[PDB]
Amino acid sequence: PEMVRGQVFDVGPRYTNLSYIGEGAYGMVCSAYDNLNKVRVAIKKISPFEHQTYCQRTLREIKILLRFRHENIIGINDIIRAPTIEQMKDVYIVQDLMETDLYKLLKTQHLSNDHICYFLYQILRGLKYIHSANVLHRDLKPSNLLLNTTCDLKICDFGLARVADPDHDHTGFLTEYVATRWYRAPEIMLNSKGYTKSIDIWSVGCILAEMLSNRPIFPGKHYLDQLNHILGILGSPSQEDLNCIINLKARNYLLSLPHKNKVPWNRLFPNADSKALDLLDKMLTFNPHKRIEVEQALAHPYLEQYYDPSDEPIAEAPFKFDMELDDLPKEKLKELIFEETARFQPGY
Numbered sequence: 001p002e003m004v005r006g007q008v009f010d011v012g013p014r015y016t017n018l019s020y021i022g023e024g025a026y027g028m029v030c031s032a033y034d035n036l037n038k039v040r041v042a043i044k045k046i047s048p049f050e051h052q053t054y055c056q057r058t059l060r061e062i063k064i065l066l067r068f069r070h071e072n073i074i075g076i077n078d079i080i081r082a083p084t085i086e087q088m089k090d091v092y093i094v095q096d097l098m099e100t101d102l103y104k105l106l107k108t109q110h111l112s113n114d115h116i117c118y119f120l121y122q123i124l125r126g127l128k129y130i131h132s133a134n135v136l137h138r139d140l141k142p143s144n145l146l147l148n149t150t151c152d153l154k155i156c157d158f159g160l161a162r163v164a165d166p167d168h169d170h171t172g173f174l175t176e177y178v179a180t181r182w183y184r185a186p187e188i189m190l191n192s193k194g195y196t197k198s199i200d201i202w203s204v205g206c207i208l209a210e211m212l213s214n215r216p217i218f219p220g221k222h223y224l225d226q227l228n229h230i231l232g233i234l235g236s237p238s239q240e241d242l243n244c245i246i247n248l249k250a251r252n253y254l255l256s257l258p259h260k261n262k263v264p265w266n267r268l269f270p271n272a273d274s275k276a277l278d279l280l281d282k283m284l285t286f287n288p289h290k291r292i293e294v295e296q297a298l299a300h301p302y303l304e305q306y307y308d309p310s311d312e313p314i315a316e317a318p319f320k321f322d323m324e325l326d327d328l329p330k331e332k333l334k335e336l337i338f339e340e341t342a343r344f345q346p347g348y
């Protein structure tokens, strides 16, 4: 049993020579050597069993990744856990190892317009497959976009992913949210639970802006500050976009603000490709009903040298409904995680 940052990684003997590569609230990621396939891999230790919320998220992440197979999406190669429910303290997901992430890359490197175009194409190609499966990623950000030296990109971290539920998306003003602040769509703070595909498109728009300048476009200092940054650039929403906001607290908040004019994309990004800024504008649309969809984004003139719908696959088996796991206790969720991972066990 190897040890990384005071965390036991019970993955042997197949997986050895571990090294820290990432973290979350209830998990840790390591790189390791796979003695069977003779390659280095990424291993994610998930420790969710003490919290019901974490158990729901674990079962979703596993179920989703086991169904998905796409070049621009991190897959599951193996799942390690103890042979019995009693002995199962953690769950280890084995994934292909990637060299870096877009967050690490943007901290140090200027991207050429060809690199932005290629990385954006891959994000949208992977996102087309996810949305085609009736799934929402809900935490797209640069650290969840993995890269190698040949510029291949893979979307990772489906820990907050859900089946889309547009009929149950409505909520109140400033209602609590999980996903990362800077990549949060304005409707999250206003009237959305983030159960529609347009949530992911906003995050992609924030990522594109960030690839263009190496700086987050909307860097809210805290939860409440986020809408200030968005409206600071986009300007006051139109009468038509306000009439779509029917909860009075959110509407009246927006109506109380002094008029703010739109900051043109060409002033924020004076070196950017005019086609890239046109697509950015359509992704960073205030009204989610007017926001560009993934298949429209792929067909945008900015991506014309890559666009090929016959080479942009969709999911063979989309998820029909979400799982109703909210009332299920963490002990019952532990059982479903055990049953979902059974196929990877020796002597199965």
Ligand SMILES: COCCN1CCc2[nH]c(-c3ccnc(NC4CCOCC4)n3)cc2C1=O
Pocket: 021, 022, 023, 024, 025, 026, 027, 028, 029, 042, 044, 074, 095, 096, 097, 098, 099, 100, 101, 104, 143, 144, 146, 156, 157, 158, 159
């Ligand atoms: C506790 O989990 C929370 C969510 N989450 C955190 C980030 C993350 N990274 C990887 C991963 C997979 C493959 N290859 C690499 N490679 C590294 C990229 C960065 O540079 C060093 C190598 N990372 C998976 C996850 C993940 O699911």
